[PDB]
Symmetry: D2
Subunit: 390 residues, 4 copies
């Protein structure tokens, strides 16, 4: 259960979400435009960069704290939910833990001022097999020259801070995969080019784009550097996604919780056969089932949030994300069902919840990849996926 | 299994669907516009009014014949699938079976000319409890005067032939629920007004609208009349809907079958970890599960199509529609999953398949109402839904 | 997560369960005999009456403490699991909280000496509708005279302490449902008769019996009495059952956890096609699914255990029991599947796990009745089940 | 739908099942003894060896015919269901199609006289990977000498006709896997030894045993011989199991149909809260769901039954068996649930239905193996399961 302090934080997040964000969710989905007005208020209320240390102007809060807040934001608007995830977990967490003092201040100043960082890993031919990426960074003096292409970049065209993963070469000699920090300004940098938008089924208020690097010049001071090498550093950087996974799970949970509350209210108001739909036992049991799965999902995510060291344990986070994301797909569809034909109408928000929830078994590591991860832990086995793995 | 003649019919439907309709499905979803040119080609290829008797210029085909055709159309475009349903089953079937010679000719001439009839039953405050409808038909001489409002009317603003269900009153005295034929054109009729469009999650190429009746005047020769009471006639009219349900189940099935085929093809061409996704056993079993459920759904629908007398048996139809629609929701979602992030992009058709499939556990009697229907048969009892049902 | 002290308690429970109980589970299922020697060891290790206050010789532990212990016992033997539930939660909790000093001492002395109390509520014609019970308690001076019949009484013929629920009448006038304490020994009491044994699919090591009352005479000092009415007291008594439900959910979970562990171990040692079954991705994902659901169930149960005041919150308890029991039915069946044909042989414990797990969606309030309970909370309304409930 | 002739056959099977077999099912499960009395009447009513050609005294009926009959038998008693499968499909089908005139008459005379043949393939270390079997047959003159061990032999100790699969060696040179016919008599043959009984969760009325061969001498005339070789013959012999799979599916379906009918009757008779349980919508929808899955299962099996040439198409049969067996596990458990605590009692038959149904996702090819088979057809791919398959 939550501490008094956590309850206060939850209430503050709920108040902003309900009083400001909830009434914007339809228009944000309709226009597919980044809600700058909401982001400013998310910032002003202290909900961006929450886990940044107080030494750089952060609140020094926990993963659990952010998950509590994320769920409240997502209940109002899926876009605001994901904005809250990206401005608190993931790239910013990786920079916070492995970044130089300089890199941390840069990233913190941007996030605390309202930037939602973009992480740039995935490519058209490199998804679940991320290490197959072709984006490369070639050494040139005290700089690295980046060439390549990413896609489905959440925040493409609106994010300023970018964390880019690239295969690193020193004078033609492959060093491994490294991460590079760059800042998209109204002016530069030269060679960081936003590409075409990938219009999506849901969470449409955040642009997802291709992203290209044409001789993008990055100083070595903006490469995340590791003493024991890049190959070990890249795995260390990946551990940041364990936190982002729990946050993403909390967005799916928030969407589902919203749909559930709306469906339950509708069952009590809507009448057929002379009585509220709530009086029909078949629907009552559907409500019960949604409630049970939602509670389990919340427990899985909050439990995962406090596991591990700096980041959630990889297997607890994987278990919770599988569960939350599948829960959200079932709950949003069944809540839509409570509305009947009105649920199929775009003038009601139920079909949007289904569209919004659907990405969470996919993005950031698919439910399938997560199942393999969980199995590798239970079976205490490496589970190589290549033809010659065994 | 299918007859030789049915295989030919299936292949001719597939031919039109794949050569003409498939390349239009994305744009139809984008524009949300009724695909008039496609409808002309559906008509010209002989796939509208197929069960109409040959005497009025129909092909005299069976329910099974139509569901075979519908699944092929729906594999190409969900909108063309539903158009094929409404122009072959439901309202047109009710008229074909219970209509007078004059009513059948009127309806046949319109459908064979390319009209997709609209059926007008549901109201904002009367959906599952269709018997609580407030749309009213008051006898006035040899006419009935209609007042009321329907909604989610498929074809609102593009359909010409309408079949409107209303509570019938004679001198204030309720007679039962009756069905009234009218034809919308640019001239009239007076008092038939197309209301607002209800924009939808999917199958966006047919407009769904509110529909208002303001002293709409219908002659008694355009009412479907039964020699012994509307109270048994309404039940008879709703049997024509057993046929519509199998057709709608076939649309859901076609959508899912398309998604399945696309998903399977993607697994074989897409590589990660140095090999096609098809080589992963977890995905192989997902593929097997989809195939098993698709096959079952297809059997359920065809079995229902040949059941009953004039129309499919109400309970076999309900069972098949439950099964097919739930199958489609699972298969379209799982096929989308095979595509990864690309599956979430609207530049691919997988997210549309999910949106399209989702209406079929809802329209024409929800999966919940169908479960109650099937239970009433198995338990062999009336299952009243009112508070005083058992008193 | 668990406290250091709770980890020690868990490990001590595991120690007893694995070193002593695990090797007896097969034989307990074969004989269907109450495992007296095992019960003595459960007692001597301090795992009976754990929530009893220290003043009467208990350990004063929490609900969470008990569910941690119960899951360990159930992993070894379902019978020892249920024995641990009944000797820590439910009847003994009702008495501990609402009993007089005299009643608590009587009950505490019996439990700490190794007695597993029986709770006596359900009747052949009154299960889910517990409020329709026909077992009757008629006031006669300072006594109540009990007449009636219970069944599926866990511990029938071996339990000494009984807590019997009966409809209370004073001069023919119904007062509500009340709870009455009695102790069965070889001497008496007169009119308490153990009826026939109901042989069961699983958890066969505790006898389940009919129980008859024939003018069973109970002094009013052995009735659980409430300062303001049985009509609120019965509701209070049934709150003690919220605790029993979490315990029973923990038994279901322990059974499933055991089956899971055995299944996983088998996959790693069993080879077909030249390699361990563990290397097949289809089975790897089955393993992942089981783990995810087990983890959720464990969280649900522990969350419920710390909810509420004296006893777990009725709705968190209902939710957790729904989840845990359904999880166990799926996990035990799927773990059995990992064994192939060996899993169907009674010389392996997998088929027993399925049989054992299956009671937990039924006993103490079925999964259906629990769904209604949870719905009543979410919808915040009474959900009467009678024909006239809404009139 | 069924033809008039098929309906008549169905009625005749139902009449025997209901008037004779149904009242025996509890005792057969309780004693775990082979019901000789029922078998005699199954024989006398013409329900054994139904697909044997009329030239050898059979009825020349179809796979669909047998599936219709099997379901009716299984509705009365799971044991009688499996007896009907084994005396009509499987080993007897393989002998009927690939056997010599001599082998066919032998097998037909035995089955028509009431023998339930035993097929002997599986071994402790050879299950899904059946070709890994170690039972061997070594050439010796005009005979073969068999040594090895099988298990889970359905009919061990009561079956007379045995069809044994063994790895064949000619003077030490491996020839492939072949099938051998032998007949267990009260006297011989020497070296055919019934082993220990494997007591089972359900379908307890048929003994499942280990089986051993100690220098079991079989004349070459009782080996099933193929002109194009054993390696191609063994695959041909396997095709017989496609028919047995559909029959086994019909047993699972029959068990489930029985449980469903009993559950529905109980909902109408049992009252709580002043009314029949049948009036509760939650249960009504459970009934509806069972009905839908049962109908689909029946269609899948009957459709599979008429597919293929001599035997059902391997993929249609695999699809139908997966479906029927999983359907039966869900339906029997939910029907048990309708009975409440009484359902858990062994004095009612509901817990037996669950135990009986459970074997059918396992025996004769597990649901997992069948999923791989179905996938291999959809993907048009061989799906090798060995480490070096790719
Ligand atoms: C809304 C959205 C936002 C995104 N935002 C970002 C972002 O900001 N930054 C970024 O870098 N990326 C982003 N992505 C990309 C996403 O994280 C990756 O694409 C993800 O890894 C999925 O990869 P993929 O699409 O190539 O799937 P694939 O790897 O091609 O997989 C396709 C299918 O095959 C399955 N599969 C793959 N491999 C295996 C295997 N060995 N066994 C079994 N099954 C298997 C998958 O589960 C999936 O079902 C985003 C994606 C979405 C949808
Ligand atoms: C895409 C689309 C096209 C349509 N086209 C047409 C058309 O052309 N002509 C026409 O007349 N109508 C049409 N409809 C309307 C549709 O057929 C009806 O609206 C349908 O009966 C559902 O009605 P409802 O939305 O009012 O649901 P409601 O009756 O309000 O029900 C809402 C929810 O409560 C449930 N429910 C209701 N009653 C009960 C009960 N007694 N027990 C348990 N659960 C219950 C429902 O299953 C549903 O989940 C269309 C609808 C859609 C979505
Ligand atoms: C192993 C075991 C041990 C037990 N130990 C004890 C014990 O020690 N003490 C004791 O008092 N009892 C005990 N019981 C009895 C058990 O708690 C009750 O019997 C239970 O309440 C179920 O009652 P029932 O079997 O009469 O079900 P019924 O009430 O007859 O219900 C039968 C079916 O109808 C459903 N149903 C009923 N009512 C409704 C409704 N309004 N809406 C929807 N569905 C509905 C039920 O969910 C169930 O599926 C035990 C039972 C078992 C199996
Ligand atoms: C009631 C009963 C009656 C029987 N009667 C007979 C009979 O009369 N004659 C006879 O010859 N045999 C008989 N058998 C044996 C049965 O047909 C075989 O044992 C069956 O092939 C299962 O093999 P197995 O137990 O060794 O499972 P295994 O092959 O060891 O498999 C164990 C588990 O791993 C899975 N598995 C295996 N391989 C793979 C893979 N590549 N990918 C994914 N998953 C996998 C399986 O699905 C299963 O879940 C009977 C069995 C039973 C239960």
């Amino acid at each position: 259960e939550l501490t008094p302090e956590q309850r206060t934080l939850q209430t503050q997040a709920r108040e902003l979400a309900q009083s400001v964000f909830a009434s914007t969710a339809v228009q944000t989905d309709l226009t597919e435009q980044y809600p700058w007005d909401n982001v400013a208020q998310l910032r002003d209320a202290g909900f961006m960069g929450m886990m940044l240390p107080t030494s750089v102007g952060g609140r020094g809060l926990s993963t659990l704290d952010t998950v509590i807040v994320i769920e409240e934001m997502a209940k109002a608007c899926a876009t605001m939910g994901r904005i809250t995830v990206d401005s608190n977990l993931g790239a910013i967490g990786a920079i916070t833990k492995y970044g130089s003092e300089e890199q941390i201040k840069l990233a913190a100043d941007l996030v605390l001022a309202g930037d939602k960082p973009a992480i740039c890993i995935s490519e058209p031919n490199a998804g679940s097999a991320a290490s197959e990426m072709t984006t490369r960074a070639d050494k040139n003096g005290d700089h690295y020259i980046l060439n390549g292409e990413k896609y489905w970049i959440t925040g493409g065209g609106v994010s300023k801070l970018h964390l880019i993963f690239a295969r690193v070469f020193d004078d033609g000699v492959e060093q491994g995969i490294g991460a590079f920090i760059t800042v998209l300004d109204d002016h530069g940098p030269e060679g960081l080019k936003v590409g075409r938008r990938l219009y999506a089924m849901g969470v449409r208020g955040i642009p997802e784009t291709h992203l290209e690097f044409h001789d993008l010049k990055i100083h070595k001071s903006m490469m995340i550097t590791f003493p024991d090498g890049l190959k070990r550093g890249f795995a260390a950087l990946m551990s940041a996604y364990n936190a982002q996974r729990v946050g993403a799970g909390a967005v799916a949970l928030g969407i589902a919780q919203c749909a559930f509350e709306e469906g339950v209210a509708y069952l009590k108001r809507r009448e057929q056969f002379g009585r509220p739909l709530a009086e029909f036992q078949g629907l009552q049991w559907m409500v019960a089932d949604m409630s049970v799965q939602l509670e389990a999902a919340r427990l899985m995510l909050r439990s995962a949030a406090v596991s591990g060291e700096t980041f959630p344990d990889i297997n607890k986070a994987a278990q919770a994300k599988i569960f939350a994301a599948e829960t959200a797909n079932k709950v949003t569809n069944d809540a839509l069902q409570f509305f009947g034909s009105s649920g199929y109408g775009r003038h009601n928000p139920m079909e949007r919840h289904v569209r919004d929830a659907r990405m969470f078994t996919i993005a950031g590591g698919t439910a399938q990849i997560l199942r393999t991860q969980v199995a590798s832990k239970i079976l205490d086995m490496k589970l190589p996926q290549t033809r010659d793995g065994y």
